[PDB]
């Protein structure tokens, strides 16, 4: 309909905006400063 925004705009009159690139700002979330411990054992209560 109206107010819609296209993205291709190939060989036809119109106006279109490309989707945001955001590729030069790629970070990585690993949170290195976090430690957890895993172990096995024998206890009194818990799901085996």
Q: Which residues bind a copy of itself (CB under 8 A)?
A: 8, 10-11, 29-31, 33-34
Residue 42 tokens read as 């024998």
Closest CA to 18 of 29, 9, 27: 9
- CB 47 → a copy of itself: shortest distance, Å? 26
- CB 3 → a copy of itself: shortest distance, Å? 23
Q: Report yes or no: 14 and 2 within 8 Å, Cβ to Cβ.
A: no
Complex with a copy of itself: residue 13 or 45, whichever CB lies closer? 13
- CB 36 → a copy of itself: shortest distance, Å? 11
Q: Report yes or no: 16 and 10 within 8 Å, Cβ to Cβ.
A: no
């Amino acid at each position: 309909s109206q107010y819609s925004i296209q993205q291709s705009l190939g060989n036809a009159s119109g106006v279109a905006v490309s989707p945001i690139n955001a590729d030069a700002t790629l970070s990585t979330g690993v949170a290195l400063n976090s430690s957890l411990w895993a172990g096995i054992g024998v206890f009194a209560r818990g799901k085996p």
